[PDB]
Amino acid sequence: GNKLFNIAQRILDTNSVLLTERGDHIVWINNSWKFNSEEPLITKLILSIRHQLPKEYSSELLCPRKRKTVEANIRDMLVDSVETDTYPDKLPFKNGVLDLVDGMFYSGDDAKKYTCTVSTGFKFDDTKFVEDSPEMEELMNIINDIQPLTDENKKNRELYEKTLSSCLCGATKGCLTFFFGETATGKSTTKRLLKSAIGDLFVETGQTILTDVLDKGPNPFIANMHLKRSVFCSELPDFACSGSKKIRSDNIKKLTEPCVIGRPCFSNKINNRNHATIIIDTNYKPVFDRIDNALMRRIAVVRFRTHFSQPSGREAAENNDAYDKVKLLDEGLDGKIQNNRYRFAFLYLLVKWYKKYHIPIMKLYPTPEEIPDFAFYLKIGTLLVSSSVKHIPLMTDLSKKGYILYDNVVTLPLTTFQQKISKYFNSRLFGHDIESFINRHKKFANVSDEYLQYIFIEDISSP
Amino acid sequence: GNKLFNIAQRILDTNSVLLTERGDHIVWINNSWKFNSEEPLITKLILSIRHQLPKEYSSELLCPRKRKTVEANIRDMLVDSVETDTYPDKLPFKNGVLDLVDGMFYSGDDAKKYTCTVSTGFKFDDTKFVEDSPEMEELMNIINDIQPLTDENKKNRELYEKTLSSCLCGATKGCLTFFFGETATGKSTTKRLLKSAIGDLFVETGQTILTDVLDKGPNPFIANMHLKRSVFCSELPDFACSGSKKIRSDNIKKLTEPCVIGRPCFSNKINNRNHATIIIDTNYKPVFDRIDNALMRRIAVVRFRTHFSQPSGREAAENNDAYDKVKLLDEGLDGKIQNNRYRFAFLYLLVKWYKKYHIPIMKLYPTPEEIPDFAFYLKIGTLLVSSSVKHIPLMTDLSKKGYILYDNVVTLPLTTFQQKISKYFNSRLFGHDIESFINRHKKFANVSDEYLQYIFIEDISSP
Amino acid sequence: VETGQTILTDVLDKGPNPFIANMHLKRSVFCSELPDFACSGSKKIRSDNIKKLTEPCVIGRPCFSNKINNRNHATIIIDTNYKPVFD
DNA sequence: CCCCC
Numbered sequence A, B: 001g002n003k004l005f006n007i008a009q010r011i012l013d014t015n016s017v018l019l020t021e022r023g024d025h026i027v028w029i030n031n032s033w034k035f036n037s038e039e040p041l042i043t044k045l046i047l048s049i050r051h052q053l054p055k056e057y058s059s060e061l062l063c064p065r066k067r068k069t070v071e072a073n074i075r076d077m078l079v080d081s082v083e084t085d086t087y088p089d090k091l092p093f094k095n096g097v098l099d100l101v102d103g104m105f106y107s108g109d110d111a112k113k114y115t116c117t118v119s120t121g122f123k124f125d126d127t128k129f130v131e132d133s134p135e136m137e138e139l140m141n142i143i144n145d146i147q148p149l150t151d152e153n154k155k156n157r158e159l160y161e162k163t164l165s166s167c168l169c170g171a172t173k174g175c176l177t178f179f180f181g182e183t184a185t186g187k188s189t190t191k192r193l194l195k196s197a198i199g200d201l202f203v204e205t206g207q208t209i210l211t212d213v214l215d216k217g218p219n220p221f222i223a224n225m226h227l228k229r230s231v232f233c234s235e236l237p238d239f240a241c242s243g244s245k246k247i248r249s250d251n252i253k254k255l256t257e258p259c260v261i262g263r264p265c266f267s268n269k270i271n272n273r274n275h276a277t278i279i280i281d282t283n284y285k286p287v288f289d290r291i292d293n294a295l296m297r298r299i300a301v302v303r304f305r306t307h308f309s310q311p312s313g314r315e316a317a318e319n320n321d322a323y324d325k326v327k328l329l330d331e332g333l334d335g336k337i338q339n340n341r342y343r344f345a346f347l348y349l350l351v352k353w354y355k356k357y358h359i360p361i362m363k364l365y366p367t368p369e370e371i372p373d374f375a376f377y378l379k380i381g382t383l384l385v386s387s388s389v390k391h392i393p394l395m396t397d398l399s400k401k402g403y404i405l406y407d408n409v410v411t412l413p414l415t416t417f418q419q420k421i422s423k424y425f426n427s428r429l430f431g432h433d434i435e436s437f438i439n440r441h442k443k444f445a446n447v448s449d450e451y452l453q454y455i456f457i458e459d460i461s462s463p
Numbered sequence C: 001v002e003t004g005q006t007i008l009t010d011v012l013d014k015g016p017n018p019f020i021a022n023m024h025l026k027r028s029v030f031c032s033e034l035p036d037f038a039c040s041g042s043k044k045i046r047s048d049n050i051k052k053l054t055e056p057c058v059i060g061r062p063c064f065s066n067k068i069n070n071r072n073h074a075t076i077i078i079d080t081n082y083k084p085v086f087d
Numbered sequence D: 001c002c003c004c005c
């Protein structure tokens, strides 16, 4: 009995509705997996696949009440969760899945085995996914204008290519990249090109994810990054002028983890999967509230140094020290990019870069030598080291150099340490930094009298 | 079988219901696309469209329960999403779409192709959309009073026309405009005229979008500009009297982007499409917290200099240097404008100006010479040149002026550079600006020594 | 489970305390990158909070919840690099 | 329930 129960069982036997570990209901319609808590996806699937059931079952599914009964039966039948979005080298489209390691495009049940629950939102066109075209030469000219193929720009260009290509691989990336440069240098053009290329896998959020508390309450600004392969933030302010909050290192470290806590309004799903490449456009370098060794492992910088100016302001730009090259501005390029002219050309370029930079494992490495905020830590980290045991047979040398021994621990006088620091970094130049380092790296032998359990590398080098 | 399903399929075959990429269901009623998130209009469409169905189908749609069944069927039928508001040269009305490029007015299925989800809110009158009328003469008299057709006011008048006409096109603009003048000069009259002309494509917000962070929590002030073609802000709080917040350059840069990040109350949507010309009525010049070249790329100024006064204060007005002309105030003009007397005359004028200023691509250009804040930067840009390869083969002569060579680069001492700068600008004028420039462009070979790699134009010119 | 330095350098109860609530049937709690006390101008870990953690039911509630009586079967492991200072 | 507070 229960024709409706039989219909629900038949639909469940097709493996077209699945329950995820988070609590979602993903359905397979029109050659793609979709989930949406606001749309009647299960009844949509029932109506869509009414054609694959017997003729006596097809006519029963034209009634919304009966479709809702079938949906209730299916919901009670789904008891086990599944693992979704586990292939980091598959790019999902609206009509199939592209193999990023092989170049094969799968449609239908071939693409169904990879439970890719997101998509670009548009259809793959193999007649445009071609190497040579009128659009490809123009796109290559644009890219070579933005990032010149010169010898002094080799490393920066390769880093730019790697960062752009990493927006295809759906895994957790462990760095935050900063597109730094002066005005009119191509950063927004690059952003728009990437958005056109990867479609719905691209999202843009606010600086609140960098300068606010992520726990909070309902946070759609974080909940909108679930499974996105690229996240953009833009327009960092100048932190030198007091009045702007600094970037939270806690947020920076929390954004590189495989899961991020944040939930929408009227929703109970708090944890989102992190597959994102986070890129920040800025005219100014970042300043963080607190600097430590971990934070320095998650920051990378790509610099833009080509100006596109109108003919009136070309001469003033040619004498600027923030530009290496000046080019003529193009006034139709924005519209051409907006109309998705270079979508498949840039997609092909990104796939080629993915192949080139995906030597067995692809990983993003930090560039801490570019951020001025990290210079004080980087310099002093190679000059002073903790107490020494194998250098214990040098206590006479330490005493002659000014150090003292206390429980076989090297201690330096505060005044002597200040005088030594003044040589490498002037007091007038970095008094706040030197005083903070003295107060932070030193232990308190008393309320007033204290000592630093850190000796200079050069002092120990002296025999 | 299933008359209701047949009705639903027939209605779906007319493409009168669409599902948008933001999750809305837009319906085609009364020659326009409409949607309401809090109260869907699909049943309204069913009732309205019942007249185009067979006679045996029209009678079933008089029952709300049957209409709801048909709506459920349609909702299950709608699977794919569509893109809306993609034509910038179409002006939507409540009964059709006006082709700005061509001049033809489309109604019916001709206006259906352009999925414009916004409208002016009033119907287009072809009889009032005429060049020869009693209203047009008065309107041109008013406009020539506000912005005279002299030779001194020619560029200002052209900028005025361009900014006013740019409120008809649905595309992202690159500049923010300031309507600057003294009191009783026609700025609010211009705002009211434009509001009367374009109806619901016009919005007015607060200064929070200029002086406050946009992401934060729910911000209806920034979320209400979605797809608006004109945004007005008024009455900047003069910043000389300390106690008023300054304008955020980060906000200025963010308001120019094609997408603005901000959400309403009880909404998960965090992106808004920027189609708006943003204008601010001011008695005072803007003051920004940080001034850089990226800010000086997005500011334009139109100045109003005609005074409309009561007969009593005419002489005290004529002895004022802020006015180039004094006329007689009209007391019925406010009511005449509020009664939509010049709506179609001003609309015709705006379309004519659109055609005039839409040489193939129309673009808003900055006017950085009208802001006194930018003067120091503009002068410094001309009074200095960055040392280059050509500067190297000049050291033997540059030593006469005190210039030195270090690291194969021509540089000058900090004290000498400070004295040279003081020789051009006094301390009391821009001491803070000079100090900020020195801090932001200083090259410190040692921690105690600082220098600038810039040369004065006079020394380079002299041989 | 792993939590930041909020549980140590802030109020354990406060308002919403997800960090405190995450120890609910969590046999191990980890803390990383502790704020060494040599710097002047930082908050302090509370001996009262230590005693509260030693109590057989530590104060802690989830968001929009009143079931603050969450049983404690947790041993906290705190990882740092500098000697702590207790007032 | 969010927002508000």
Ligand SMILES: Nc1ncnc2c1ncn2[C@@H]1O[C@H](COP(=O)(O)OP(=O)(O)OP(=O)(O)O)[C@@H](O)[C@H]1O
Pocket: A141, A142, A143, A145, A146, A181, A182, A183, A184, A185, A186, A187, A188, A189, A190, A281, A282, A308, A327, A328, A329, A330, A331, A333, A334, B294
């Ligand atoms: N290769 C190119 N050749 C010619 N014109 C270009 C090229 N790339 C970009 N342009 C144009 O020159 C200008 C460059 O500004 P763009 O918005 O790309 O960068 P930006 O000012 O650094 O960005 P942001 O919005 O982050 O400040 C734009 O008007 C763009 O259309």
Ligand SMILES: Nc1ncnc2c1ncn2[C@@H]1O[C@H](COP(=O)(O)OP(=O)(O)OP(=O)(O)O)[C@@H](O)[C@H]1O
Pocket: B141, B142, B143, B145, B146, B181, B182, B183, B184, B185, B186, B187, B188, B189, B190, B282, B283, B308, B327, B328, B329, B330, B331, B333, B334
């Ligand atoms: N061409 C004109 N001829 C006669 N009267 C005019 C004309 N244009 C405007 N007026 C009237 O003169 C007055 C000027 O006020 P208006 O609102 O235009 O000034 P405003 O520049 O916005 O002033 P404020 O800066 O104080 O807001 C109004 O009463 C307006 O109706």
Ligand SMILES: [Mg+2]
Pocket: B187, B188
């Ligand atoms: Mg006014």
